[PDB]
Design a protein around this ligand. Structure first.
Ligand SMILES: [Zn+2]
Length: 206
């Protein structure tokens, strides 16, 4: 039975084999690939079609691997950003087994949007969806530190946690624009430098 997934991480084992961590629509899989170091289809961030052979008391063996390429796979700039996000997502999901199809479907949509959109903008939009799906999005701007309302200029920290600029160091964004971003799920309201700063917050960890 074929399955599809995104490779989130690989680790060399034995001479040329790989342990391959794969996000599917049902599960984060930890699988064993014979001679995986030789296989140009097996790289973090790649999407694959594959099958699994179950093994008693051991990892499933990764078989029947077909690389599902991206239209933009040759653009090293975009692939760098993609692999940064994938590594952040691996660390976020590292201890998870079963999970919602949300995560696989989110990555599928990112890959599509990567064709024509700015990769950092796509990741910023995607992270907003992760926060909302996990119930971690603070749409009310109450300061994490002093518990008071924050108005007009909002400081954001890791995981878009809100603060007064006088209460914590982070990056500042206009309230009206953050509200538009959170409502529309579209970071188009922010200019390029604001996107860069949201992306720096994402790189603190999901
Ligand atoms: Zn405060």
């Amino acid at each position: 039975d074929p399955m599809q997934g995104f490779i989130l991480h690989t680790q060399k084992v034995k001479d040329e084999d790989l342990i391959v961590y794969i996000l599917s629509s049902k599960m984060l899989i930890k699988a064993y690939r014979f001679y995986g170091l030789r296989h140009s289809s097996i790289l973090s961030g790649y999407k694959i079609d594959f099958a699994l052979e179950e093994n008693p008391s051991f990892l499933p063996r990764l078989k029947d691997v077909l690389h599902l390429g991206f239209l933009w796979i040759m653009q090293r700039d975009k692939m760098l950003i993609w692999q940064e996000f994938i590594r952040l997502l691996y660390r976020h999901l590292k201890d998870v087994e079963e999970l919602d199809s949300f995560y696989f479907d989110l990555l599928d949509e990112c890959v599509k949007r990567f064709e024509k959109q700015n990769p950092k903008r796509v990741i910023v939009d995607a992270y907003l969806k992760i926060l909302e799906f996990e119930g971690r999005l603070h749409k009310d701007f109450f300061c994490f530190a002093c518990d008071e309302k924050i108005q007009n200029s909002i400081t954001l920290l890791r995981a878009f946690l809100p603060s007064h600029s006088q209460c914590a160091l982070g990056f500042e964004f206009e309230e009206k624009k953050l509200k538009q971003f959170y409502s529309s799920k579209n970071c188009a309201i922010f200019d390029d430098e604001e996107i860069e700063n949201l992306y720096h917050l994402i790189k603190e960890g999901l």
